[PDB]
């Protein structure tokens, strides 16, 4: 899937975690976000098409996805400890990363 499908998947599962009528939907949703984030990390966004992969901007943009994937993997840890609210609160924390990247690169 291209970059915007991944972003759509990230968007839809974030909402899933917020309304989780459970405790293992969190895990399920987080797994899909992990998959989407990782896959979106290999894509060059529109506003950096003409730039070098070695360019600081490309590493900065890739760093955002490292941080995001780290935040999800940590929430997957909390959710797999059965800590439903902390994992859901860790998922709220993710929007920092979404918005920091959108502000500079979308």
Span 28-87, contacts to a second copy by CB under 8 A: 54-56, 59-60, 62-63, 66-67, 69-70, 73-74, 76-78, 80-81
The least CB distance from residue 47 to ligand HEC, in Å, is 7
- Decide which of ligand HEC, a second copy, none touches 105; Cβ closer than 5 to 8 Å per partner kind: ligand HEC
Asked if residue 4 binds a second copy (CB under 8 A), the reply is no
- For the chain, give the DSSP string: --HHHHHHHHHHHHHHHHT-SSSSHHHHHHHHHHHHHHHHHTSPPGGGTTS-TTSHHHHHHHHHHHHHHHHHHHHHHHHHTT-HHHHHHHHHHHHHHHHHHHHHH-
Q: Given the rule CB under 8 A, which residues bind a second copy?
A: 54-56, 59-60, 62-63, 66-67, 69-70, 73-74, 76-78, 80-81
């Amino acid at each position: 899937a291209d970059l915007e499908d991944n972003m759509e998947t990230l968007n839809d599962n974030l909402k899933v975690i917020e309304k989780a009528d459970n405790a293992a939907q969190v895990k399920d949703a987080l797994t899909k976000m992990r998959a989407a984030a990782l896959d979106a990390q290999k894509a060059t966004p529109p506003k950096l098409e003409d730039k070098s992969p070695d360019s600081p901007e490309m590493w900065h943009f890739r760093h955002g996805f490292d941080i995001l994937v780290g935040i999800i993997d940590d929430a997957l840890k909390l959710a797999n400890e059965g800590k439903v609210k902390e994992a859901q609160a860790a998922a709220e924390q993710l929007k920092c990363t979404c918005n920091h990247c959108h502000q500079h690169y979308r």
